[PDB]
C-alpha cells in the first residue's frame, strides 16, 4: 500500500523527515548507513539543487563524474 | 424525514422547514471542511510514495 511503500527509502535524511525521527536516526546510525542523497527530499533538506528539473543536468553530470575516473 | 420541504426559496420557508434544513447545512460545512484535510493527507501520502 502507499503508506507502506513510502516507508521504504534508502536515504535516511529523507526518512527522518516524514517518519518517526527518533527511531530513524538510531536505526540508521547503528548500521552506519551512508546517505548518498540522490533523491529530492534529501536535496531539499540539505539545501542543494533538486535532482529533477533544471537540476537533472547538474546531478547527472555529477553522478557520472562520481564512481568514475 | 417523510415530510419533505414543500416550499422553496422563492416562496418563504417557515420555522420548521428552515430548522430542518439547518442540520443538512451544518453537516455540509463540517463535511467539506473535513474533506479538505483528507484530500491533503492523501496528496501527502501520494508524493511521499513517489
Amino acid at each position: 500500500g502507499i503508506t507502506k511503500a513510502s516507508l521504504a527509502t534508502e536515504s535516511f535524511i529523507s526518512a527522518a523527515s516524514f517518519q518517526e525521527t527518533t527511531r530513524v536516526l538510531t536505526e540508521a546510525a547503528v548500521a552506519g548507513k551512508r546517505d548518498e542523497l540522490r533523491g529530492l527530499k534529501e536535496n531539499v533538506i540539505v539545501g542543494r539543487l533538486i535532482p529533477a528539473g533544471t537540476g537533472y543536468a547538474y546531478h547527472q553530470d555529477r553522478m557520472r563524474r562520481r564512481a568514475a575516473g | 424525514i417523510e415530510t419533505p420541504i414543500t416550499a422553496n426559496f422563492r416562496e418563504g420557508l417557515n420555522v420548521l422547514q428552515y430548522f430542518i434544513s439547518t442540520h443538512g447545512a451544518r453537516k455540509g460545512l463540517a463535511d467539506t471542511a473535513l474533506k479538505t484535510a483528507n484530500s491533503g493527507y492523501l496528496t501527502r501520502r501520494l508524493v511521499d510514495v513517489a
Binding site: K4 | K35, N38, L42
Partner: peptide
C-alpha cells in the same frame, strides 16, 4: 462503499471487510 475513502482504501491496498476468494 464509495467516495474518497474508497480511493484511499484502493491506494492502501487494504483487504475489504467481507472479501471473496479466488
Amino acid at each position: 462503499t464509495g467516495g474518497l475513502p474508497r480511493v484511499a482504501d484502493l491506494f492502501e491496498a487494504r483487504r475489504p471487510k467481507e472479501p471473496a476468494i479466488l
